[PDB]
């Protein structure tokens with residue numbers, strides 16, 4: 001029906017939470033998991049992360065205790081999501097935001113908190129928690145040097161675990177109808193795992209609770225699990241620290257799973273590909289840990305996994321296959337990159353142009369010929385396409401179809417230069433380039449034009465249907 | 476309460492829709508609008524756009540008519556969001572996706588549909604609808620040359636308007652409780668405006684319906700409104716075409732508003748800043764048109780505006796102030812860029828270093844000194860910070876605090892080189908740079924080191940607290 005959203009909302013703050021639970025049947029079938037793998041899609045909140053709840057809640061606690069008045073300044077150390085939540089709460093309720101975040105965190109978080117009118121001071125990645133150049137020490141310094149400033153200190157404030165104990169765990173219970181057998185949840189601030197696991201074990205003591213920790217952190221128990229990469233910086237953002245936060249009750253969690261960067265990212269891409277959940281990397285870590293932990297479960301039992309972040313914050317980082325190749329991470333089992341590498345291999349455009357049959361007789365024009373002259377030349381040469389170029393270095397491609405239709409549409413004068421109607425988006429290539437690379441370039445450019453670049457004697461233009469016909473010649 | 480999400484979902488497809496309605500009280504107060512400006516936050520759907528509904532629905536229609544079997548190929552021309560929705564539906568229900576989208580559309584849409592296992596063929600931006608190099612003609616060609624392929628043709632399929640007439644308009648009616656005075660909604664495919672306006676005028680004939688069209692399209696009525704930039708390419712993505720789609724019933728809409736790129740983008744940034752809705756550019760266009768149209772309304776009346784897209788698809792394009800400056804768009808009335816330009820102006824770091832007082836006596840090391848030697852030098856020189864550099868070109872900064880804490884943490888051996896513990900994230904600057912630029916660079920780098928680059932004689936390091944103290948000297 002319609003109970004929570006059947007009305008109009010006073011502000012975006014009331015749109016936090018109420019996130020659905022989806023069954024990852026396809027992903028379980030992919031990885032061969034018998035039980036029901038349920039996913040709590042926290043990234044569908046207003047700000048696209050679970051920490052929005054605690055942001056709103058810490059603001060509510062600061063307001064119910066009268067410790068907060070309009071015009072004040074809020075300071076908060078964060079990996080990026082709590083900064084977003086508190087920036088939302090401030091832009092709504094009229095507070096000033098100052099965010100401290102390590103340089104390791106993505107740039108999208110910074111851009112978004114800048115759009116939200118929040119000041120951003122960054123800290124070095126390698127700084128330990130004891131350093132005054134850590135985000136927490138710098139936040140303390142800003143509190144000491146700024147007037148009317150407040151730190152909510154998500155690492156030690158009780159609102160962070162108490163709210164996941166109050167509403168989120170109750171949401172999971174109400175939608176799972178009490179039947180929860182395993183709960184896999186990342187260990188960042190530790191507030192969400194503490195709260196959720198505490199409430200669940202109170203209302204379902206038979207439920208196991210598994211925590212996810214990236215290889216590099218010291219949050220796992222025992223210390224035999226941390227020695228993989230002790231205090232080695234990792235790419236996964238949001239989870240793991242070099243110290244135990246104040247809100248983390250490591251006794252409420254039963255098992256611990258260490259997860260590396262590669263598995264986290266490849267599993268995040270697998271989630272996106274197989275379920276269609278635009279999710280973050282920490283969620284890949286959580287789901288990989290869940291797949292490792294709930295293997296022994298049987299059908300009917302439900303393993304609940306948290307999906308903390310959206311792809312929005314890592315859109316440029318790991319959604320782009322370029323950056324994952326730069327860091328050498330397995331793309332996915334079934335991915336477009338592996339598909340292209342399988343079909344093309346090292347086949348270069350020389351091979352395609354040779355097997356197809358061309359003589360590099362692509363006409364050229366100085367890009368300011370009148371369209372009358374260029375159509376006379378096109379009709380005298382019988383070609384359909386032409387390439388326009390300048391003297392100071394390419395302009396683009398131009399076809400007779402666009403000529404006619406633009407002349408009819410009133411955008412192409414007879415005396416106008418051909419540069420005005422040519423296609424200006426182009427991708428330059430050279431015969432040594434592989435077919436996989438031109439396939440990746442076709443994802444962003446409609447045509448791909450070749451050149452020798454030794455005279456500028458281009459041999460032809462390449463489009464996706466050309467590669468499709470070439471693959472039709474193969475099998 | 477909990478009616479629509481109180482259970483577990485079979486797949487992500489069932490998480491489409493059910494989007495909340497938020498009152499834009501702060502934005503109305505910013506622009507001086509008396510009535511209640513309501514916003515339908517369609518970007519909170521599973522795939523972050525309104526077109527997910529029609530994607531799911533066209534798949535449902537193709538399945539209820541038996542025209543669709545597993546393993547088939549789906550082809551669809553789109554500006555990017557329908558491609559995402561149909562890619563979700565295919566990755567869930569086991570169909571193959573091939574997407575045709577103009578080169579004008581953002582790269583995030585391409586990356587996301589690549590993650591969803593969809594093939595992407597792009598078309599030139601300047602191509603007219605009649606051209607066979609248009610996305611629609613290329614889609615037709617692919618249908619002709621591919622086996623088991625289907626085109627759902629969102630421009631002419633009745634599912635697109637019928638579903639907005641069935642559920643979305645009913646959602647808006649149920650949450651507005653029937654009282655809707657004005658409805659402002661962008662004109663892209665025209666299906667959403669047709670369906671919603673038809674249902675509303677059926678259930679509330681006194682409601683006016685206003686359509687939003689970017690300057691460049693020919694969808695507005697009359698033709699006196701299109702002559703601003705006739706068929707001139709524009710940056711706004713999703714709305715406006717060079718022809719009337721089959722599903723668009725231009726008679727159901729009363730007024731038409733033309734919106735340019737600058738207003739759309741600046742209003743999108745204003746929405747993000749003042750309400751905290753991570754929204755797209757087309758939504759900026761819609762909200763600007765609404766602010767222009769509902770000006771004559773009075774208190775109590777409700778003007779409903781659609782927010783079609785999320786910032787996720789335009790994260791690199793217009794959220795980044797760099798690209799908006801590259802295209803010369805007014806950032807916002809209150810924005811971080813204007814704030815920094817107001818406080819700093821053209822003040823350069825030469826002025827700051829001169830007024831503060833320094834002698835460029837920053838120590839240097841060849842980045843492989845033993846930490847014992849570097850701490851002996853640091854204690855003999857009394858300085859706290861040091862800059863480490865190589866011979867083949869900078870390594871970073873290094874402080875005694877991190878030295879001590881890493882020696883205690885077991886990451887810094889006494890015989891180890893200083894390069895292992897130095898801070899490796901840095902931003903190079905030069906004295907001619909303004910303070911606004913170093914403030915923008917501090918958004919992404921913790922330290923900013925200067926250099927003359929004429930000997931490499933750096934004068935000092937700059938952090939955000941340095942600029943804060945400098946501004947404390949000002950007013």
Ligand SMILES: C=C(NCc1c(COP(=O)(O)O)cnc(C)c1O)C(=O)O
Nearest residue numbers: 078079082188189190192238282308309
């Ligand atoms: C510590 C912070 N992040 C917690 C977090 C986590 C860990 O969740 P916790 O419940 O806080 O332990 C997982 N994934 C992401 C993307 C996260 O941002 C923060 O935003 O300050």
Ligand SMILES: C=C(NCc1c(COP(=O)(O)O)cnc(C)c1O)C(=O)O
Nearest residue numbers: 553554557663664665667713757783784
């Ligand atoms: C035409 C398409 N976009 C419609 C759209 C619109 C226009 O909505 P329509 O209801 O289709 O007219 C507005 N904003 C965005 C971001 C959109 O994607 C498409 O995805 O194929």
